[PDB]
Design a binder for this molecule. Structure first.
Ligand code: FES
Length: 106
């Protein structure tokens, strides 16, 4: 599998999220820890407003609107494609997923 993050300006750092990890976990090292969420796997912040591709946000879980409530008033706008970086794992099923960065960074 593979995982590449993007920035609202294009800056995208590629990496490999082991199986059973979250783009946030691989972020602690890959450096996305700075270009990813903040509260971590937890869901109390809104800086993890990442904008993922349309073919990789499917394999991931279907986080209802529950966790969306806090991700609904984020500092930016959200769409069905956005996802709290602290709520998506990159299993061997998804490969070469394209994650993006919110319009802002809280
Ligand atoms: S990283 Fe804090 S809510 Fe997702």
């Amino acid at each position: 599998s593979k995982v590449v993050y993007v920035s609202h300006d294009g800056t995208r750092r590629q990496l490999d999220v082991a199986d059973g990890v979250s783009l946030m976990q691989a972020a602690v090292s890959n450096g996305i820890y700075d270009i990813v969420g903040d509260c971590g796997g937890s869901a109390s912040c809104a800086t993890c407003h990442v904008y993922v591709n349309e073919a990789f946000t499917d394999k991931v879980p279907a986080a209802n609107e529950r966790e969306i409530g806090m991700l609904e008033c984020v500092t930016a706008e959200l769409k069905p494609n956005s996802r709290l970086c602290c709520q998506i794992i990159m299993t061997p099923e998804l490969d070469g997923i394209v994650v993006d960065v919110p319009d802002r960074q809280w």
